[model samples]
Target chain A: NIXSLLRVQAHIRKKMV
Target chain B: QLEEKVDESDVRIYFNEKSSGGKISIDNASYNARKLGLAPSSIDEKKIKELYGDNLTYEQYLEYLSICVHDKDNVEELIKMFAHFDNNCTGYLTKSQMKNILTTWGDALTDQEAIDALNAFSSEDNIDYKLFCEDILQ
Candidate 1:
């Protein structure tokens, strides 16, 4: 679950820029 | 007025967690900037503590981002822009009208892009200003 969250977080972070 | 809007980004906040090593991630930073109606950037620890209170988990921070993106001033500007395009005072605009308005704004959108944007929110031939503001602009 943490890994999945981190993956999504990374994806969101990439897009936020 | 524009200067004041640009200055809204000055308030800063920080987040601490082992995963982030007390650093605010880009998403969180952008959220803070947006919440204050500013451009995304970084800030200070005490400001973060004071603004957000203690112990915000990364997940909670992400949730905050979702809420802040719709900050009032930003929404207001979006509404104003939409009103500008609804020049006919008919409270709605067809895709063709939207195309002209988009071009008038000095940045043109192709027919496909305009259609795609309208289709993303509603299937109707024309978009109601109020509905467009509520559904797409926000």
Candidate 2:
């Protein structure tokens, strides 16, 4: 859960400013 | 479950570790308030849905079970943290919520350690994530 969340989080942060 | 290789908990209760000829025995594992005795398990929606038992509508059920399947009783603190983060009445975990937890605590956990923890949780035949959380957090 932690790692999966990190993957999703990293992707979103990459897209956002 | 009593006779099992327990997680690394630094408790003063009862502890014994012995290894010989590739066989091992750990007795008197800790039972701290925090720290879960984890076993590896996959996120099973079917199992989770069974627990909810028509208490919520399908959409609300799905929203809660999505995380519940992966996280059970042992993760109350984590769930509380998330719920506190999602104060906008949104049922989903947003990117900001994830970022806030990650940026604040990510450094405290290494990727290898997280993977190791995941495997320990999933590898166990029956997962008691609560025990896992308490033990690991300890």
Candidate 3:
């Protein structure tokens, strides 16, 4: 659901910055 | 029954963490999309409908762009693309710029998916494409 995508985005943000 | 109260949006959302995931939406989806490096096209209505399905839920687009690249040719192609994508010819691809392209391209990828793709093969700031591609398909 939305949480899955949000979780992924959050994960990406963590690695990016 | 649900718990969180909706404001003027008046949208009742349900949450049952024990059974399955909750079903709630960010009121300002576009606003939130930007913070995650996919604003302009992350929640794009047209592309979402055109590429995926017309009835895709708000977050469904995020799942769709989760591209699966498994073939060797594909990974190799990405290297060529990333190499030329290096504009200054310094053999370094910046993170912010890569995110911009990854999320804004014709077939935009989710922020998470984009980084997952790069992080598997790139560096901390500017990506180390050489090490990345070889590692991924080596």
Candidate 4:
């Protein structure tokens, strides 16, 4: 689901920077 | 189910990117909002500042977008539109279908934005519309 996907994206962004 | 409780305090610290104590100025927020394709009229400086203040987290940015456009009624309308294209009866739609249908939805997304939204939600090159509605619109 996009909600989970968006949360994953948010988590990835947090880790990347 | 993707719906799960999230800790706002944890979300707060994680998205606290700006060194200015997790804050973003009006100019930055406006620019960011505009970059996300929000209309100029929708870009209310006072409202953004009032809601987000100097400290703006990514969580707040999501909130801003929801308030500015992705409200409940809009989502329901989009969900209905999405269901119309589910011709296969598989409870899902392919990327091409999503790209085609998304352009007709709220705010009339540009082709690239449609593709981005598709990519954001889809897995294995297909979108589960039911799952999307359950996780996103619920």
Candidate 5:
């Protein structure tokens, strides 16, 4: 369940503003 | 694209220029990670919904990230944050209410950022914050 959140976070945290 | 090719994260190709004669041993971590790539997977519909629901906007995602970043057992903190936002105790609030709280009640974000933040999680104007917290903080 939580791994989903981590993957989303990882997706968002890159090339970030 | 090729500029970043040799990122330490990538598995290096062992074969060198014109010297190709067989033995290709891989590193432990990368090889293991590679092994796991073909690991068993199923169509996790429930998790897909949760992740889909948790398409948090940038700043709110950052805000949520802080909770996880600090510690693992953050149920208490999640409750506290959710409690503060759900001041009405109705298990629901408006997107406007959420933005207002994020901007002032907690000062976690600005008006512009707060507006952007609530664009997901709970889609309707009348937001179901309890569902959001439950979905994401799990």
Candidate 6:
């Protein structure tokens, strides 16, 4: 489920950026 | 079925929808652990076991982090773990499709926790898939 982890990571990054 | 977590590495493995929901946009539940505002964990670390799934109807949406969380299998029935993770029970993974599998386990961790864990796991020099798997899942 690292992909899901990446999903959230990317999602959070999107918020920050 | 083997008697050790080590043998679990031998099963046919692939990286399909190996992740979780991102930025869920529900009506009243915009962000309840499934959203990207919070970091998510990997499937392996999910700790989802069969017994728990049977016991708890919503266990599908619960976080699997302890032995008590599992019910259907043990060392002898290791495949059950994979079966549960399969989500769709199709024995294959795809880009945007999962195997009826959807959960919000990673909602337990924060975005920083996820990033830190990923960083720590990647920092390992001899990183292998299993080790990589454990880092995120654990």
Best by TM-score: 4
Indicate the worst ten consecutive residues by lDDT in candidate 1 chain B: B38-47
- What TM-score would you give candidate 6 relative to the actual structure? 0.22
Which RMSD values do the candidates have, in order?
13.3, 18.0, 12.2, 8.9, 16.3, 16.3
Q: Candidate 3: TM-score?
A: 0.36
> In order, what lDDT does every prediction score?
0.45, 0.34, 0.43, 0.47, 0.37, 0.30
lDDT of 5 by residue, B3-56 (tens): 132232332331221112332312222122222221111122223225533233
Q: How many times do residue backbones clash in model 6?
A: 10
Tens digit of per-residue lDDT, candidate 6, span B1-138: 111322222211111112223211121111222222222223322333333322222223223212212223222232222334545556433311221122233333454544444455455432232333433232
Tell me how many clashing residue pairs each candidate has.
0, 17, 2, 2, 0, 10
Please give the DockQ score of every candidate, comma-separated: 0.03, 0.05, 0.08, 0.08, 0.11, 0.08
- Preferred candidate (lDDT higher): 1 or 5: 1
* Candidates sorted by TM-score, best first: 4, 1, 5, 3, 2, 6
Off by more than 4 A, model 1: A1-17, B1-70, B74-76, B103-111
What would the per-residue lDDT of candidate 3 be over residues B78-117, giving only the tens digit for each residue? 4555566677777777777667655764445678768776
Cα-based TM-score, every candidate? 0.39, 0.27, 0.36, 0.40, 0.38, 0.22
- Top model by lDDT, which number? 4
Write candidate 1's Cα lDDT for B9-114 as tens digits.
3432333322265445444555454444433212232344556765455554544444334234233444455566566777777766655554444234446655
Question: Number of the top candidate by DockQ?
Answer: 5
| Candidate 2 residue-wise lDDT at B88 | 68
Question: Could you give the DockQ of candidate 5?
Answer: 0.11
Clash pairs, candidate 6, are A1-B18, A1-B43, A3-B19, A4-B19, A4-B20, B45-B137, B51-B71, B51-B72, B87-B99, B88-B99
Candidate 3 share of real interface contacts = 0.00
